[PDB]
């Protein structure tokens, strides 16, 4: 095994209330069913309630079509749902992020 000291991250997931996609639901749904169960600590950073997130949630991904869900780590961009997804599947979620 290993252990030692625990590390503070500021893991944030930008999800949306208002959507028509839909799809994107399933992706948020999962991002925080995933992270729910893996125990992650985490904000919901909801985008609908302030319009100004949806775009500084863009400018932080890097481009203005972007959309939900999205994986934050205090000032770092994990990426998008698939990136997340992937990691998580190659049971390197802890890579991805900033974890370690």
Do not use: W
Request: hydrophobic fraction near 30%; aromatic fraction near 6%; include cysteine.
């Amino acid at each position: 095994g290993s252990e030692g000291a625990a590390t503070m991250s500021g893991l944030r997931v930008y999800s949306t209330s208002v959507t028509g996609s839909r799809e994107i639901k399933s992706q948020q749904s999962e991002v925080t069913r995933i992270l729910d169960g893996k125990r992650i600590q985490y904000q919901l950073v909801d985008i609908s309630q302030d319009n100004a997130l949806r775009d500084e949630m863009r400018t932080l991904a890097g481009n203005p079509k972007a959309t939900p869900p999205q994986i934050v780590n205090g000032n770092h961009y994990c990426g998008d749902y698939e990136l997340f997804v992937e990691a998580v599947e190659q049971d390197t979620l802890q890579e991805f992020l900033k974890l370690a």
